[PDB]
Swiss-Prot record:
Subunit structure: Part of a SCF (SKP1-cullin-F-box) protein ligase complex. Interacts with SKP1, CUL1 and RBX1/ROC1.
Gene name linked to the record: FBXO30
Stated name of the protein: F-box only protein 30
Chain positions of all zinc fingers (TRAF-type): 55-94
Domain of life, source organism: Eukaryota
PTM annotation, UniProt: Auto-ubiquitinated.
Role description: Substrate-recognition component of the SCF (SKP1-CUL1-F-box protein)-type E3 ubiquitin ligase complex. Required for muscle atrophy following denervation.
Amino acid sequence: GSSGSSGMEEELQHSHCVNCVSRRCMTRPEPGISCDLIGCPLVCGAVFHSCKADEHRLLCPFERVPCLNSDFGCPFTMARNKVAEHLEMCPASVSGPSSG
Ligand SMILES: [Zn+2]
Ligand SMILES: [Zn+2]
Ligand SMILES: [Zn+2]
Ligand SMILES: [Zn+2]
């Protein structure tokens, strides 16, 4: 009788990608140096390396983000850029039409 398993997942950064700002990069994707490029899954309008994506999302505006005033308790959620349209009619904005 016996029993046992094996398997270890681990990935590192890409020397190339890590140093690749150009969105329209066309460098042969090498296993260890540079990976294939992929367009944002939110059609935000940016081209980054599949590996960078994870990081890009952090910046990408489209990325689903909670109301700027999430602290107050706004159950609303939308793109970082589409936060205004909501903030205008948002309760956690305490911003009246006060004009002149
Ligand atoms: Zn690149
Ligand atoms: Zn990469
Ligand atoms: Zn994006
Ligand atoms: Zn809100």
